[PDB]
């Protein structure tokens, strides 16, 4: 993985030694080249994963997440350079350094072959994320949002660390390849019940599981755009990726330990979708939308079927690009009206016709219009969950109805109707803003032409 | 009450640069930053990256499996063997308990 780790670190000297006015040009140009080279990770085989060395490996589950992670860095620089335009030069470079360090930890997280290595890098993402939110957030509540994010994560991670070190003691290794051949069944006992909870509750918090989701709307409402893009697109996926890897060694106990968490996700997705219908804050609506979408991923991972893992893989990528796009779209409005209230600025299709096309495209992917990968992922989870129990089709079907209702309601509220009379500073969309949305939606739609590369290792 | 700068009035890039692309206040930097984004973002990653993905060699041996499956179906039907036999492993190599 050193062909990606070293170039990513080189983004730090490049940013720091760039001429004052060129920090955004240079970092964006070279972070796109790194994203270009990330396509070499797609040398995947039917049987064996791509195992580079004793430290790092790539398979069909980490490759799409790795390509998504490196694609996102150049997009966050475009989204960031406006509201930082008046920032002190050095503090601009530190902000960019935090994003670069986040990509560095993330690409190593997704490729670490050792679970304790995964944990350290998994837990290291907290530092840059916390700093971004609390330092470059714009409101008072960014400090509380930082603490909730910090202590929700550590509350689950510290039990996870104990469980992993216990597992290496009794199994001898935490290398993921080794654990595939040396895994032994987990038998019923109160001791193994708590080993199961420790191994999973750290990932459930990052998804987030309904019930443990209340840190997420806080963080989003207070984070800067770049913090919201990485948090929604990639950081939520750390939990899903961790659950797809750790469930290997939790069988067959996952058969009955999954039940409470499937109930929370099946019911939680209906309630979070319904909450989206009454949200008054635009960023908070998109945050509660992620909780609804990620509840499908939890259900899919927990029922453990070939179709459910393919569906969950597609959902994570598709939701990553869609949720990031929606946040950027709401930010473009916020940079104008300087408010997150959804009802404040209405009838924007009249004043910003092309930005209204981006809003339409983003909403359609959110409600999963065929054949988008948002639907493909969502459909595969529904097909497999129906086999798990036919009655779930009712909850799955209802969620699609509610998901359509609030996706188009957000489109209708802000883009249609009459424009707000007194808001007279809606300047035409900048080339920067239009390019930012096209870089979300075009790759998302292109993947429909070849979806196998986002269907994970069970394809 | 206490000494503090007032919040500066929000600024509009089009005011002093009607051709602004929104990247920078400097027109020369603004055009450059636009070109690196559009060139590398669209010309390189999306166009070449899509072409690269289109021509990936037998990603996860999906074509090989079909070719092999054809070879076995031809063989087993000519020699009268079952197309697919339920036992995945040869039962002579197994030793059941009790």
């Amino acid at each position: 993985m050193l062909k990606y780790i070293i170039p990513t670190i080189m983004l730090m000297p490049l940013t720091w030694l760039s001429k004052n006015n060129m920090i955004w040009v240079n970092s964006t140009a070279h972070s796109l080249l790194i994203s270009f080279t990330s396509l070499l990770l797609m040398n995947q085989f039917g049987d064996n994963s791509l195992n580079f060395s004793l430290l790092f490996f790539s398979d069909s589950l980490s490759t799409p997440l790795l390509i998504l992670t490196m694609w996102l860095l150049p997009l966050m620089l475009m989204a960031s350079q406006h509201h930082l335009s008046k920032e002190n030069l050095t503090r601009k470079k530190l902000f960019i350094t935090m994003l670069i360090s986040l990509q560095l930890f993330l690409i190593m997280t997704f490729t670490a072959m050792e679970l304790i290595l995964f944990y350290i890098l998994f837990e290291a993402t907290l530092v840059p994320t916390l700093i971004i939110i609390t330092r470059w957030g714009n409101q008072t509540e960014r400090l509380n949002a930082g603490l909730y994010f910090l202590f929700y994560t550590l509350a689950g991670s510290l039990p996870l660390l104990v469980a992993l070190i216990y597992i290496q003691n009794t199994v001898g290794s935490l290398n993921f390849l080794m654990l595939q051949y040396w895994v032994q069944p987990v038998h019923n006992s109160w001791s193994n019940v708590f080993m199961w909870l420790a191994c999973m509750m750290a990932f459930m918090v990052k998804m987030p599981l309904y019930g443990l989701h209340l840190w997420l709307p806080k963080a989003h409402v207070e984070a800067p755009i770049a913090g919201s893009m990485v948090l929604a697109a990639v950081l939520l996926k750390l939990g899903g990726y961790g659950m797809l890897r750790i469930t290997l060694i939790l069988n067959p106990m996952t058969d009955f330990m999954a039940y409470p968490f499937i109930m929370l996700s099946l019911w939680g997705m209906i309630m979070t979708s319904s909450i989206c219908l009454r949200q008054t804050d635009l960023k908070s609506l998109i945050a509660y939308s992620s909780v609804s979408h990620m509840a499908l991923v939890i259900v899919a991972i927990l029922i453990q079927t070939p179709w459910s893992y393919m569906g969950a893989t597609a959902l994570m990528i598709a939701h990553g690009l869609t949720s990031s796009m929606l946040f950027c779209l709401a930010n473009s409005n916020y940079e104008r009206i300087h408010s997150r209230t959804m009802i404040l600025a209405r009838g924007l299709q009249t004043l910003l016709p092309l930005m209204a096309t981006w809003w339409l495209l983003a909403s359609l992917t959110n409600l999963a219009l065929p054949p988008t990968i948002n639907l493909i992922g969502e459909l595969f989870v529904v097909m497999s969950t129906f086999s798990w129990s036919n009655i779930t089709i009712i909850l799955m079907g209802v969620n699609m109805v509610i998901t359509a209702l609030y996706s188009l309601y957000m489109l209708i509220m802000t883009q249609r109707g009459k424009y707000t009379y007194h808001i007279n500073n809606i300047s035409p969309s900048f080339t920067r803003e239009n390019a930012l949305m096209s870089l979300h939606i075009l790759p998302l739609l292109l993947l429909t032409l070849n979806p196998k590369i986002i269907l994970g290792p069970l394809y | 009450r206490w000494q503090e700068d007032p919040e500066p009035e929000d600024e509009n890039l089009y005011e002093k640069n009607p051709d602004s692309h929104g990247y920078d206040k400097d027109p020369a930097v603004d055009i450059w930053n636009m070109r690196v984004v559009f060139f590398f973002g669209f010309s390189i990653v999306l166009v070449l990256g899509s072409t690269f993905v289109a021509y990936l060699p037998d990603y996860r041996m999906q074509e090989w499996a079909r070719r092999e499956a054809e070879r076995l179906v031809k063989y087993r039907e000519a020699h009268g063997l079952p197309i697919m036999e339920s036992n995945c492993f040869d039962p002579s190599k197994i030793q059941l308990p009790e």
């Binding site: 470059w136 714009n138 960014r142 | 919040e7």
Partner: peptide, 19 residues
């Protein structure tokens, strides 16, 4: 709206003998 930063009322939360 420019970034919020602590004012006097906020700072005095930390100037007492105890929190």
């Amino acid at each position: 709206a420019r970034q919020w930063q602590p004012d006097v009322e906020w700072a005095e939360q930390y100037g007492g003998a105890v929190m």
